[PDB]
Design a protein around this ligand. Structure first.
Ligand code: 4UM
Ligand code: 4UM
Ligand code: CA
Ligand code: CA
Ligand code: CA
Ligand code: CA
Ligand code: CA
Ligand code: CA
Ligand code: ZN
Ligand code: ZN
Ligand code: ZN
Ligand code: ZN
Lengths: 166, 166
Protein backbone atom coordinates (compact mmCIF):
# COMPACT_ATOMS: atom_id res chain seq x y z
CA UNK A 1 0.00 0.00 0.00
CA UNK A 2 0.86 3.69 -0.19
CA UNK A 3 -0.17 6.69 1.84
CA UNK A 4 0.13 10.37 0.93
CA UNK A 5 3.43 11.29 2.61
CA UNK A 6 3.60 14.76 4.20
CA UNK A 7 6.82 16.78 4.06
CA UNK A 8 6.97 17.50 7.81
CA UNK A 9 9.74 19.99 7.19
CA UNK A 10 11.90 21.38 4.42
CA UNK A 11 14.79 19.03 3.56
CA UNK A 12 17.09 22.00 3.11
CA UNK A 13 17.90 24.93 5.40
CA UNK A 14 18.33 27.48 2.61
CA UNK A 15 14.96 28.51 1.20
CA UNK A 16 14.11 31.10 -1.43
CA UNK A 17 11.04 33.30 -1.71
CA UNK A 18 9.60 35.55 -4.39
CA UNK A 19 7.08 38.36 -4.05
CA UNK A 20 5.11 37.73 -7.24
CA UNK A 21 2.91 40.82 -6.96
CA UNK A 22 2.00 43.62 -4.56
CA UNK A 23 -1.07 44.84 -2.71
CA UNK A 24 -2.46 48.31 -3.52
CA UNK A 25 -2.60 48.98 0.23
CA UNK A 26 1.10 49.56 0.99
CA UNK A 27 4.23 50.78 -0.80
CA UNK A 28 6.50 48.20 -2.46
CA UNK A 29 9.07 49.05 0.22
CA UNK A 30 6.62 48.45 3.07
CA UNK A 31 5.60 45.09 1.66
CA UNK A 32 9.22 44.05 1.18
CA UNK A 33 10.11 45.07 4.73
CA UNK A 34 7.11 43.27 6.23
CA UNK A 35 7.93 39.97 4.51
CA UNK A 36 11.66 40.25 5.29
CA UNK A 37 10.81 40.82 8.96
CA UNK A 38 8.29 37.95 8.95
CA UNK A 39 10.93 35.50 7.68
CA UNK A 40 13.46 36.81 10.20
CA UNK A 41 11.08 35.80 13.00
CA UNK A 42 11.75 32.16 12.12
CA UNK A 43 15.35 32.38 10.88
CA UNK A 44 16.41 34.08 14.13
CA UNK A 45 15.63 30.91 16.10
CA UNK A 46 16.59 28.16 13.62
CA UNK A 47 19.29 27.39 11.04
CA UNK A 48 16.82 28.40 8.30
CA UNK A 49 17.99 31.07 5.87
CA UNK A 50 15.75 32.96 3.46
CA UNK A 51 16.82 34.63 0.24
CA UNK A 52 14.64 36.67 -2.10
CA UNK A 53 14.50 35.88 -5.82
CA UNK A 54 13.04 38.43 -8.24
CA UNK A 55 12.39 36.05 -11.11
CA UNK A 56 11.46 32.45 -11.79
CA UNK A 57 10.46 29.76 -9.33
CA UNK A 58 11.27 30.05 -5.63
CA UNK A 59 10.45 27.70 -2.74
CA UNK A 60 7.97 30.09 -1.14
CA UNK A 61 5.97 31.98 -3.77
CA UNK A 62 4.14 34.93 -2.24
CA UNK A 63 1.22 36.69 -3.87
CA UNK A 64 -1.91 38.75 -3.32
CA UNK A 65 -5.16 37.71 -4.93
CA UNK A 66 -8.92 37.74 -4.53
CA UNK A 67 -11.70 35.18 -4.84
CA UNK A 68 -10.61 32.30 -7.10
CA UNK A 69 -6.92 32.94 -7.72
CA UNK A 70 -5.59 29.70 -9.17
CA UNK A 71 -5.67 26.98 -6.53
CA UNK A 72 -9.37 26.32 -5.93
CA UNK A 73 -9.09 27.54 -2.33
CA UNK A 74 -10.88 30.79 -3.16
CA UNK A 75 -10.87 33.81 -0.88
CA UNK A 76 -14.14 35.31 0.25
CA UNK A 77 -14.06 39.10 -0.12
CA UNK A 78 -13.60 41.38 2.90
CA UNK A 79 -13.38 39.66 6.31
CA UNK A 80 -13.41 35.94 7.06
CA UNK A 81 -10.37 34.28 5.45
CA UNK A 82 -7.37 36.61 5.44
CA UNK A 83 -4.67 34.49 3.88
CA UNK A 84 -3.47 30.91 3.61
CA UNK A 85 -0.22 29.05 3.16
CA UNK A 86 0.63 25.55 1.97
CA UNK A 87 2.69 23.18 4.14
CA UNK A 88 6.29 22.38 3.11
CA UNK A 89 6.63 20.56 -0.20
CA UNK A 90 7.14 20.96 -3.96
CA UNK A 91 5.12 23.16 -6.31
CA UNK A 92 2.43 24.94 -4.29
CA UNK A 93 3.96 23.70 -1.03
CA UNK A 94 5.28 26.55 1.12
CA UNK A 95 3.47 29.16 -1.00
CA UNK A 96 1.62 31.99 0.75
CA UNK A 97 -1.43 33.84 -0.57
CA UNK A 98 -2.94 37.01 0.86
CA UNK A 99 -6.55 38.09 0.30
CA UNK A 100 -6.42 41.54 -1.21
CA UNK A 101 -10.04 42.14 -0.33
CA UNK A 102 -8.57 42.74 3.15
CA UNK A 103 -6.83 46.03 3.91
CA UNK A 104 -3.15 45.39 4.57
CA UNK A 105 -1.08 47.81 6.57
CA UNK A 106 2.37 48.49 7.94
CA UNK A 107 0.64 49.68 11.12
CA UNK A 108 -2.78 48.99 12.64
CA UNK A 109 -5.21 50.45 10.08
CA UNK A 110 -6.44 47.08 8.87
CA UNK A 111 -4.45 43.86 9.13
CA UNK A 112 -0.76 44.20 9.86
CA UNK A 113 0.94 42.35 6.99
CA UNK A 114 4.11 41.56 8.96
CA UNK A 115 2.17 39.73 11.69
CA UNK A 116 -0.17 37.82 9.39
CA UNK A 117 2.79 36.86 7.18
CA UNK A 118 4.79 35.73 10.19
CA UNK A 119 1.86 33.52 11.14
CA UNK A 120 1.40 32.15 7.61
CA UNK A 121 5.12 31.52 7.11
CA UNK A 122 4.78 29.34 10.22
CA UNK A 123 2.48 27.11 8.18
CA UNK A 124 4.87 27.42 5.21
CA UNK A 125 7.57 25.89 7.42
CA UNK A 126 5.54 23.04 8.93
CA UNK A 127 3.70 24.45 11.95
CA UNK A 128 0.01 23.88 12.55
CA UNK A 129 -2.20 26.01 14.77
CA UNK A 130 -1.22 26.19 18.41
CA UNK A 131 -3.68 25.77 21.27
CA UNK A 132 -1.64 28.24 23.34
CA UNK A 133 -3.67 31.47 23.26
CA UNK A 134 -0.48 33.52 23.43
CA UNK A 135 1.29 31.83 20.51
CA UNK A 136 1.94 33.37 17.09
CA UNK A 137 0.45 30.17 15.66
CA UNK A 138 -2.80 30.68 17.58
CA UNK A 139 -5.51 31.20 14.91
CA UNK A 140 -6.70 34.70 15.93
CA UNK A 141 -5.28 37.98 14.63
CA UNK A 142 -4.22 40.50 17.24
CA UNK A 143 -2.12 43.66 17.12
CA UNK A 144 -0.17 44.64 20.25
CA UNK A 145 0.54 48.26 19.32
CA UNK A 146 4.19 47.85 20.28
CA UNK A 147 6.93 48.51 17.72
CA UNK A 148 8.88 45.32 18.60
CA UNK A 149 7.87 41.65 18.36
CA UNK A 150 8.94 38.71 20.55
CA UNK A 151 8.37 35.20 19.21
CA UNK A 152 6.59 33.35 22.07
CA UNK A 153 8.31 30.31 23.55
CA UNK A 154 5.54 28.04 22.28
CA UNK A 155 6.40 28.91 18.68
CA UNK A 156 10.13 28.75 19.38
CA UNK A 157 9.70 25.20 20.71
CA UNK A 158 7.49 24.21 17.78
CA UNK A 159 9.76 25.44 15.02
CA UNK A 160 12.90 24.15 16.78
CA UNK A 161 11.32 20.71 17.13
CA UNK A 162 11.35 20.62 13.33
CA UNK A 163 14.62 22.39 12.53
CA UNK A 164 16.59 22.74 15.75
CA UNK A 165 18.03 25.96 17.24
CA UNK A 166 20.10 28.53 15.36
CA UNK B 1 2.44 24.09 19.66
CA UNK B 2 1.56 21.64 16.91
CA UNK B 3 3.52 20.37 13.92
CA UNK B 4 1.79 19.09 10.76
CA UNK B 5 0.95 15.32 10.86
CA UNK B 6 3.35 12.83 9.20
CA UNK B 7 0.91 11.80 6.44
CA UNK B 8 -2.34 13.21 5.04
CA UNK B 9 -5.08 11.96 7.37
CA UNK B 10 -8.21 13.21 9.08
CA UNK B 11 -7.58 14.43 12.62
CA UNK B 12 -11.08 13.35 13.68
CA UNK B 13 -12.76 9.92 13.57
CA UNK B 14 -16.25 11.23 12.85
CA UNK B 15 -16.60 12.31 9.23
CA UNK B 16 -19.56 13.56 7.23
CA UNK B 17 -20.46 13.10 3.58
CA UNK B 18 -22.97 14.67 1.25
CA UNK B 19 -24.31 13.37 -2.06
CA UNK B 20 -24.48 16.69 -3.91
CA UNK B 21 -26.17 15.37 -7.04
CA UNK B 22 -27.13 12.09 -8.70
CA UNK B 23 -26.33 10.13 -11.84
CA UNK B 24 -29.14 9.57 -14.36
CA UNK B 25 -28.13 5.90 -14.45
CA UNK B 26 -29.39 4.69 -11.07
CA UNK B 27 -32.25 5.47 -8.66
CA UNK B 28 -31.51 7.75 -5.69
CA UNK B 29 -31.87 4.76 -3.36
CA UNK B 30 -29.39 2.66 -5.39
CA UNK B 31 -26.83 5.46 -5.31
CA UNK B 32 -27.30 6.02 -1.57
CA UNK B 33 -26.94 2.28 -0.90
CA UNK B 34 -23.71 2.01 -2.92
CA UNK B 35 -22.08 4.96 -1.16
CA UNK B 36 -23.22 3.81 2.28
CA UNK B 37 -21.75 0.37 1.62
CA UNK B 38 -18.52 1.87 0.23
CA UNK B 39 -18.02 3.85 3.47
CA UNK B 40 -18.74 0.74 5.54
CA UNK B 41 -15.82 -1.01 3.84
CA UNK B 42 -13.52 1.41 5.65
CA UNK B 43 -15.44 1.98 8.88
CA UNK B 44 -15.60 -1.80 9.41
CA UNK B 45 -11.79 -1.95 9.84
CA UNK B 46 -10.97 1.36 11.59
CA UNK B 47 -12.52 3.56 14.29
CA UNK B 48 -13.95 5.84 11.56
CA UNK B 49 -17.63 6.80 11.53
CA UNK B 50 -19.49 8.32 8.59
CA UNK B 51 -22.68 10.36 8.79
CA UNK B 52 -24.63 11.55 5.76
CA UNK B 53 -25.64 15.22 5.38
CA UNK B 54 -28.40 16.16 2.96
CA UNK B 55 -27.26 19.78 2.61
CA UNK B 56 -24.52 22.16 3.73
CA UNK B 57 -20.81 21.46 3.94
CA UNK B 58 -19.68 17.89 4.59
CA UNK B 59 -16.09 16.67 4.89
CA UNK B 60 -16.53 14.44 1.86
CA UNK B 61 -18.56 16.13 -0.87
CA UNK B 62 -19.71 13.65 -3.55
CA UNK B 63 -20.78 14.65 -7.03
CA UNK B 64 -21.27 13.50 -10.59
CA UNK B 65 -19.95 15.74 -13.36
CA UNK B 66 -18.64 15.74 -16.91
CA UNK B 67 -15.69 17.42 -18.60
CA UNK B 68 -14.81 20.62 -16.71
CA UNK B 69 -16.59 20.48 -13.36
CA UNK B 70 -14.68 22.84 -11.06
CA UNK B 71 -11.15 21.59 -10.48
CA UNK B 72 -7.84 20.85 -12.23
CA UNK B 73 -8.99 17.36 -13.25
CA UNK B 74 -11.52 17.62 -16.09
CA UNK B 75 -13.20 14.39 -17.11
CA UNK B 76 -12.84 13.06 -20.63
CA UNK B 77 -16.17 11.75 -21.96
CA UNK B 78 -16.93 8.01 -22.13
CA UNK B 79 -14.17 5.56 -21.08
CA UNK B 80 -10.71 6.51 -19.82
CA UNK B 81 -10.99 8.34 -16.49
CA UNK B 82 -13.90 7.13 -14.36
CA UNK B 83 -13.57 9.02 -11.09
CA UNK B 84 -11.15 10.72 -8.72
CA UNK B 85 -10.97 11.83 -5.10
CA UNK B 86 -8.84 14.31 -3.15
CA UNK B 87 -6.69 13.45 -0.10
CA UNK B 88 -7.76 14.57 3.39
CA UNK B 89 -7.73 18.33 3.76
CA UNK B 90 -9.92 21.43 3.86
CA UNK B 91 -12.32 22.46 1.10
CA UNK B 92 -11.92 20.10 -1.90
CA UNK B 93 -9.92 17.76 0.35
CA UNK B 94 -11.64 14.39 0.75
CA UNK B 95 -14.13 15.13 -2.05
CA UNK B 96 -14.98 12.48 -4.64
CA UNK B 97 -16.07 13.09 -8.24
CA UNK B 98 -17.55 10.59 -10.66
CA UNK B 99 -17.59 10.96 -14.42
CA UNK B 100 -21.20 10.90 -15.50
CA UNK B 101 -20.25 10.17 -19.11
CA UNK B 102 -19.79 6.63 -17.78
CA UNK B 103 -22.61 4.18 -17.09
CA UNK B 104 -22.84 3.61 -13.33
CA UNK B 105 -24.59 0.47 -12.07
CA UNK B 106 -25.34 -1.64 -9.04
CA UNK B 107 -24.50 -4.72 -11.11
CA UNK B 108 -21.67 -6.28 -13.14
CA UNK B 109 -22.61 -4.16 -16.14
CA UNK B 110 -21.01 -0.79 -16.85
CA UNK B 111 -19.02 0.38 -13.82
CA UNK B 112 -20.16 -0.76 -10.42
CA UNK B 113 -20.61 2.40 -8.35
CA UNK B 114 -19.98 0.68 -5.01
CA UNK B 115 -16.59 -0.67 -6.10
CA UNK B 116 -15.37 2.55 -7.69
CA UNK B 117 -16.61 4.58 -4.71
CA UNK B 118 -14.96 2.18 -2.24
CA UNK B 119 -11.67 2.80 -4.07
CA UNK B 120 -12.17 6.56 -4.29
CA UNK B 121 -13.00 6.83 -0.55
CA UNK B 122 -9.65 5.16 0.12
CA UNK B 123 -8.13 8.31 -1.38
CA UNK B 124 -10.57 10.54 0.55
CA UNK B 125 -9.14 8.97 3.73
CA UNK B 126 -5.49 9.19 2.78
CA UNK B 127 -4.54 6.08 0.79
CA UNK B 128 -2.75 6.37 -2.54
CA UNK B 129 -2.50 3.59 -5.11
CA UNK B 130 -1.16 0.14 -4.23
CA UNK B 131 1.06 -2.04 -6.43
CA UNK B 132 -0.92 -5.11 -5.27
CA UNK B 133 -2.95 -6.12 -8.38
CA UNK B 134 -5.59 -7.53 -6.04
CA UNK B 135 -5.78 -4.50 -3.76
CA UNK B 136 -8.87 -2.30 -3.71
CA UNK B 137 -6.47 0.64 -4.11
CA UNK B 138 -5.09 -0.86 -7.31
CA UNK B 139 -5.73 1.88 -9.93
CA UNK B 140 -7.41 -0.28 -12.60
CA UNK B 141 -11.11 -1.14 -12.41
CA UNK B 142 -12.16 -4.75 -12.02
CA UNK B 143 -15.54 -6.24 -11.12
CA UNK B 144 -16.18 -8.55 -8.18
CA UNK B 145 -19.37 -10.02 -6.81
CA UNK B 146 -16.83 -7.81 -1.33
CA UNK B 147 -14.07 -8.51 1.19
CA UNK B 148 -11.41 -5.82 1.75
CA UNK B 149 -7.99 -7.21 0.75
CA UNK B 150 -5.30 -7.27 3.42
CA UNK B 151 -3.08 -4.74 1.68
CA UNK B 152 -5.87 -2.15 2.02
CA UNK B 153 -6.59 -3.19 5.61
CA UNK B 154 -2.94 -2.69 6.54
CA UNK B 155 -2.84 0.67 4.77
CA UNK B 156 -5.94 2.19 6.32
CA UNK B 157 -5.06 0.87 9.79
CA UNK B 158 -1.58 2.37 9.48
CA UNK B 159 -3.38 5.72 9.40
CA UNK B 160 -6.34 5.30 11.76
CA UNK B 161 -5.74 2.12 13.73
CA UNK B 162 -8.08 -0.90 13.69
CA UNK B 163 -10.94 0.33 15.90
CA UNK B 164 -12.75 -2.56 17.60
CA UNK B 165 -10.84 -5.63 16.46
CA UNK B 166 -13.71 -8.05 17.12
C1 4UM C 1 -6.39 33.89 11.67
C2 4UM C 1 -4.96 33.37 11.48
O1 4UM C 1 -4.12 33.82 12.58
C3 4UM C 1 -3.32 34.87 12.32
O2 4UM C 1 -3.25 35.35 11.19
C4 4UM C 1 -2.58 35.43 13.45
C5 4UM C 1 -1.95 36.64 13.52
C6 4UM C 1 -1.39 36.74 14.82
C7 4UM C 1 -0.64 37.71 15.49
C8 4UM C 1 -0.24 37.48 16.80
C9 4UM C 1 0.54 38.47 17.55
N1 4UM C 1 0.38 39.79 17.32
O3 4UM C 1 1.35 38.09 18.36
C10 4UM C 1 -0.60 36.29 17.45
C11 4UM C 1 -1.33 35.34 16.82
C12 4UM C 1 -1.73 35.55 15.50
N2 4UM C 1 -2.45 34.78 14.64
C1 4UM D 1 -11.58 4.70 -10.62
C2 4UM D 1 -11.24 3.26 -11.00
O1 4UM D 1 -11.64 2.35 -9.93
C3 4UM D 1 -10.64 1.66 -9.33
O2 4UM D 1 -9.52 2.15 -9.35
C4 4UM D 1 -10.81 0.32 -8.75
C5 4UM D 1 -11.96 -0.34 -8.44
C6 4UM D 1 -11.58 -1.62 -7.93
C7 4UM D 1 -12.29 -2.73 -7.46
C8 4UM D 1 -11.61 -3.86 -7.01
C9 4UM D 1 -12.34 -5.04 -6.51
N1 4UM D 1 -13.03 -5.80 -7.39
O3 4UM D 1 -12.35 -5.33 -5.33
C10 4UM D 1 -10.21 -3.90 -7.05
C11 4UM D 1 -9.51 -2.82 -7.51
C12 4UM D 1 -10.17 -1.68 -7.95
N2 4UM D 1 -9.73 -0.49 -8.46
CA1 CA E 1 6.46 26.33 -3.34
CA1 CA F 1 -11.39 37.56 3.13
CA1 CA G 1 -6.53 45.25 -0.14
CA1 CA H 1 -14.42 9.15 -18.73
CA1 CA I 1 -13.98 18.31 1.52
CA1 CA J 1 -23.95 8.33 -16.79
ZN1 ZN K 1 -4.50 30.46 -2.60
ZN1 ZN L 1 -3.11 29.80 10.53
ZN1 ZN M 1 -13.10 16.55 -10.12
ZN1 ZN N 1 -7.33 5.87 -7.50
Amino acid sequence: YNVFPRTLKWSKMNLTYRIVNYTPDMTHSEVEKAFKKAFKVWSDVTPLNFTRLHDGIADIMISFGIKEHGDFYPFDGPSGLLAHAFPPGPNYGGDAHFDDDETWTSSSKGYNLFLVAAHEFGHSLGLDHSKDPGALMFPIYTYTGKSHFMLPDDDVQGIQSLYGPG
